[PDB]
Design a protein around this nucleic acid. Sequence first.
RNA 1: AGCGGCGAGUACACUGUACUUGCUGCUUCUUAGAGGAACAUUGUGUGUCUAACACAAGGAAGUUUAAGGCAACAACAGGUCUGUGAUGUCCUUAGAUGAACUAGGCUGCACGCGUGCUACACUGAUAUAUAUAACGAGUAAAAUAUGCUUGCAUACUUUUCCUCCGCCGAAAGGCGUAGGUAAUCUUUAUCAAUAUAUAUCGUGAUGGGGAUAGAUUAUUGCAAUUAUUAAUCUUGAACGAGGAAUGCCUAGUAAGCAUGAUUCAUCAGAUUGUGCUGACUACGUCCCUGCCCUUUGUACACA
Lengths: 180, 157, 138, 128, 59, 48, 154, 98, 41
Amino acid sequence: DIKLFKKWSYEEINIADLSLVDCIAVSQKACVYTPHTAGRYQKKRFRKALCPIVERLVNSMMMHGRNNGKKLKAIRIVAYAFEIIHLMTGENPLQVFVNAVQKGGPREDSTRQAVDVSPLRRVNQAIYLICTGARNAAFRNIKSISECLAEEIINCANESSSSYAIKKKDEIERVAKANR
Amino acid sequence: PISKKRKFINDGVFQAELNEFLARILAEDGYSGVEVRIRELTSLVQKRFFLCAMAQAESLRYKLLKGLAVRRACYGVLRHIMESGAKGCEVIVSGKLRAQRAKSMKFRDGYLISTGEPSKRFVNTATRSAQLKQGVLGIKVKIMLPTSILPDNISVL
Amino acid sequence: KRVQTFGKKKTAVAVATVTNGKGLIKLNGKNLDLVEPYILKTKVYEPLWLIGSGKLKNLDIRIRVKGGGQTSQIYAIRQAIGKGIISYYQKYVDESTKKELKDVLLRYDRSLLVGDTRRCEPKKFGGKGARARYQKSY
Amino acid sequence: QHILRILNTNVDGKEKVIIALTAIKGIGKRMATVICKQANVDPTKRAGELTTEEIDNIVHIMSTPTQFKIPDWFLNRRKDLKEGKNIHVIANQLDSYLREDLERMKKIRLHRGLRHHWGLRVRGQHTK
Amino acid sequence: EKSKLAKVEKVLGRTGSRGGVIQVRAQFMGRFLIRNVKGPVREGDILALLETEREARRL
Amino acid sequence: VHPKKYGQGSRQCRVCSNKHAIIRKYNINICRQCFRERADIIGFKKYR
Amino acid sequence: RLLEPVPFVKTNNCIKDVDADLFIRSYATHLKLHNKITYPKWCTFVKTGKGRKLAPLNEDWYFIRASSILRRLYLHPDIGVGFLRRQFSSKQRRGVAPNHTSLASGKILRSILQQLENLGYVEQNPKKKGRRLTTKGENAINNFARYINKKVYN
Amino acid sequence: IALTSKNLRAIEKVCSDIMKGAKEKNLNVSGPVRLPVKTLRITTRKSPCGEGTNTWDRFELRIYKRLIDLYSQCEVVTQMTSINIDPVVEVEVIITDS
Amino acid sequence: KLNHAVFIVITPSAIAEKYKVNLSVARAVINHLADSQKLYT
RNA sequence: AGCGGCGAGUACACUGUACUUGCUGCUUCUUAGAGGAACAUUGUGUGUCUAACACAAGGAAGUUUAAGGCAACAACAGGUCUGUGAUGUCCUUAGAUGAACUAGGCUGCACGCGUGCUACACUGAUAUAUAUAACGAGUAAAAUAUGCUUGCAUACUUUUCCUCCGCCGAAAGGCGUAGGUAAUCUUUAUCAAUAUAUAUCGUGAUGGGGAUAGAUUAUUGCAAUUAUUAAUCUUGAACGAGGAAUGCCUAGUAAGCAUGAUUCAUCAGAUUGUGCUGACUACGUCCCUGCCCUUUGUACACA
C-alpha cells in the first residue's frame, strides 16, 4: 500500500543473515515515500535499529567537513547513485544495494584479540564503510557519484581489490596473522 | 510622556536612593513605616524630586562600634533574636580582630537552611561594615523567619 | 459546517479550517504542489492516500502558513490537517469510519497526530556550542 | 584556434572569452566583462575562435573608455589628483603608473611612504 | 577473506575496560570457544570467526 | 574646557562616580560594578 | 518531472495556482516579445546587488526582476522597494570577515517601479501606502495566468 | 481602564475586584483582556576583577499589563480604584459607550 | 591537468568519460544528440 | 490578535476561490490568569525478596522529562584598596600624585606563545526564484530672524530612536514627510542562511582563496593622518587538509549555518541569547589523567 519514492514497494527481500532484515526494520510501519524521517532515535538502545536503513544512509552520508548537516546534496548524490546503478544493472537497485552492504567484506576485526560484532553494530559499520568509500571516491580525480559507485561500491559488492573496505580488510587480516 | 519600562527604571533608581537614604538616616529606631523629623524628610524628598534583621544588625553594629567585647555583644544579640522568636541566627564577623591575621568565627544554632529558592524566600539577609582603628569589620546577620509552611516539614495528626 | 484545529511542532505553528465544499484545499493561495521540494511534497501527500480522495472531495480545507523552518512548517501542517480531519469525522461526516481512520493512523505512525517536544535548548555558558566549551590551553 | 599570442599571455583557447580577457589584464573580471559586452562578444562561444577584428574591437574599447559610456566610477584611476585627468591604463604601463605613484610617495616622504620604504603595513599589522 | 560459522548460545557476561565487550561461547568442531562481541546480542545467534585455535582470556 | 554631550566624556556614573564600564541599557546610566549589589534593591531578581 | 499529480480540486483563477519560477520565466519571455519596457541601457554596467559583487551572467536578469516584482506585489498587497531588497537579499563575503546578509540595490527596483507606473500596471494612493496592482493590471495578470495555466495543462 | 505592574498576585487581586465591581454595577463592560507577558533580560558578569573563570548571570524582570472597559461615570470608578488600589500598581482610564 | 577538447546511456559523467571531454561540452553534445543536475529521462 | 457572518465584488467555477472596504455570534486558534496531568503508572523480571533497576504498553512527558539558579563544613596568605567620599597605614599637594586643555601611546616590530575568522574546492566557485522565526530594541539639542560686524547677544516647535514612504545617486547616504514613549510604527500575513532548481565553469593554486596596495565616492565623529566605517574598480600572497602535540563532544546535543542584545557618536572577526540544517556511535570502565573512600608504611606536618 505504501511505497518508496512512488516507485518501489519492495515486496521482495532476501533472507540474508536473518538478523540484518530485523536490524534494518523494513516494515509497513516504517514504509515512507521519501527518506530523512525526523523521528526520535535516541530514546533506548533497541530503537537504534528502529530507524529505517533508507533514513540511516542519508543520515550518515552527510558527513564531510563543510557539508555536515546538509543531507540534501547527500540525498541527490545517493539518488544519482541509485539511477546509475539501475542503469548498469537491470534489476531492483534496493536489493542490489542491500546485498552489497551485506557483502561489504570487513566482517572480521582486530584491535589489541579478534572479537565478533552484533548485527546492529554490523549494519552501522557497513553504513560507515559506504560513507568513507563515498568520501574517498568523490575526493577530486574529476569524477562524480557515478564513478563513486562504479569503482567503489560495485567493487565492495563483487570483492574487487580497488575498494577501500577490501584493501583495509587485507591489511587488517595481515596484521592479525602477524600478531597471532 | 515617558515609556513604561523607562518609567519603572526611574522608579527603581528612585527607590534605591530612598533605601540608601533610609539606611543613612534611620539610626535611632527600627522599621516604623515608610512615607509615600518626618516634616524635614518629606521636605527634602520633595525638594530633591521636584524581629527586624536590619534593626538587630544595627544594634549589634552599635555594640561593636562602642568597643564592648565582641563575644559578649554577639551573645547578647543572639539571646535577643532567640527571644524575639527566630529558630536560630548566624552572625559572621570578619576583619582585624586584635591581629594582623584576618580571621572569622561562626555561631551555629537553629535550623540553618542555606540553599534553595525556598530558603531564599524564608530567610532574609543583613550585611554591613564598620570602621575601626586599622580597617573595616564586615558583619553578616542571617535570621530565618519562622515558617507559608516549609516543604521539608512533614507531620500528620 | 466548519471546524478549526491547530498543530504545533518546533517553532512553526499551523491552523486547519475544515469546511464543506467541492475539494478546495488551498495552502493559503499557493496550492499543495507548488511548495517546490517534492521530498516534503511526499509527506504532504502521505495522509491523503491513507484516507481516500472521495472523502476529501466533499470537504474544503483552508490552510494558513505563518513562518517557520521548512521541515517544522510541513510537520505542523500535517499535525493541523490530522487534527482537523479527526475533528470533522467526530463532528459532521461520519463517526464509524473515524475509529478505523485513527486506528490505521496510530498503526502507521505516531507523530502524525501528536508532534514531538524537541526544541532548541537555551545554550549555556562555556562555549559557542550549546553543550560545547572554548578550547583551553596550558 | 588555440593558444593565440597577444601583447600579454593569451593562451586561453578552450576556456571562455571572459576569463581569457581577464587573464591578460583586468583580472577582477568586472572591467573585463563590461568591456567584452561593449565590444559585443558573445561569451557563450569559447576563446578558441577569437578573431583579429574582435581583438581590435576590444583594444579600441579599452583605448580611452571615457569617450565611451563606461561610467567614471567604474573606470579605474578616476582622478590621480593633478592638473589634468587620467584613465585606466592596462597592464605594463599601468604598473608604470603605479610605480610612478610609489616614487612620488617616496619623494613626498610622508608616514605611509616611510612605511612603504620599510616594507610595513599602512594601517598596521599588529605584530605585537 | 574467509569466514566460518559460529553459534552464540549464552551471554555469560560483560567485560572489557569500557563495557562494550560481552563474553560469549562460540560453536566450532570443538564446541567450546571463548569469544567476545560488541553491541546488543541475543540468545541463539549466528556469527563468523577468524581462526580455529586462537584462545582468549577470561575476565 | 570644551564640555561635549557625546562620547566617553559626555556622562558619568551616578553612584560609583566613574564612567568606566557604564551600561546604558534602558537608560539606567548606572555602573555595573555597583549594579552587582544593587540588583536586588533595584528590584530586579536573579532567577536563572 | 515538472508536472506533478494533483489530488485536490484546483481553481486556476489567478497566478497563485502556478509555479513562481516557471511563470516568472514565461512572463519575462512575454515582456521580451512585447517590448513593453526598455532594457534599460543605464543598468547594463550595474550588478544586481552589492553582496553579489559581480555580474548576474544571465542576460535576462532585469526581465526576471520585472517578472518577479509584480509577482511579489500580488503576493503581498502593500510592499515597497525595501521589502523587495529584503526578499532578494544575498551574501556579502567580506573576505576574511565572516559572511553576512546584504540587501540588493534599490535604484534598479525604483526604475522598475517607474516603468510599471508608466505602463499603468501599478498605482499610488495616500491610503494603502505600499505598492498595489491596479484593477486593469489585476485583470491582465488574471488572463495571463489562466492562459499559461491552460498551456501547461494541455 | 488598563493596569500595569510587576507582581502577578497584585494584578490578579485588583482584576478580581474589577470584575466584581463590574458585575455589581451592571455596566456595558468588555471581557477580560490578557496581553502576553513581556520578559526584560539583562546580562552581567561576576568577578569584578578579571581574575578567575569569567562567569555570567541572566537577570529577567517580568511585566504584567491587562485591559478592561466599562460604561459608567469616571468619578465612581476612579474612587473605587483609589480606595482598592496599591501604590505599586499604575492604572490608566479609557471609557466606552456601546 | 586538463587536456580534453570539443572536436570529434546519455548520462553526463559517463559520456564525458567515454568521449574524454569536459562535462560542459558533454552537456552540449547531449542536447545536440537529443535535438543543474536532473533525473534521468 | 484569531476564528466567522455579510454590503460590494475585482475574474473564474457552477444548480466558493486569491484579494480588498465597514460592523458585530464567538475566543481551542496570537497570547496567558490559575489549576491539574507524571507517580517505575501498570504488568512480565532482576534484588539479602527489604532498599533497587530492566522489558512492553497507555501516555507529550519512563536516564528526576530535560537546560538552568541557589553550593554547606573550611581553606588558598588565589584575584581586586584602578569600583566606590568602603577601607588602616606610609607618600604628594601650588613647579599637585587635585583638576582642566594640545598632541602622541596603549595599534610601532628581529621574533615567540594562547582565543578566534577565511580558505585550501566539484557534496565546489557564480547568478536567478520559490518556502521561511524568536529574543529582541526603539523619541539639556536644530534651524530661523533681529542688532552689532560669517561670529556674538536675544526669542519661537523640537531637530537630540527605530523609521514606512516619493525621489536624488549602483551604492554609501541625503532630502520633506506616515507611525509609534511602543503586540498598533520600524516589523514581524515576516528579518537570515545553510538548502531548493535551472543555468556559466568544471578540480588546471584556476575562475578557488582573498592577504596586500593603489584609485575613490558617502555617512559617524569641531578632529578618520596610524588610510574609523564604507558602495565601486584595480591589485592576486601563502594555502593540495597541516609533524611532535592538543581541546570539545552523548540528542534539537556534536558539527555546520545564520540572527537579536551588550558596550555604540562609529566600529564584532568578542561574549551572550535566538533560530535553522538534525549527524557516526556509544549506554560502560578505570588503561591514561583527575578526584573519593578503606587498609598499610613513613625519619613529611609551610605536609
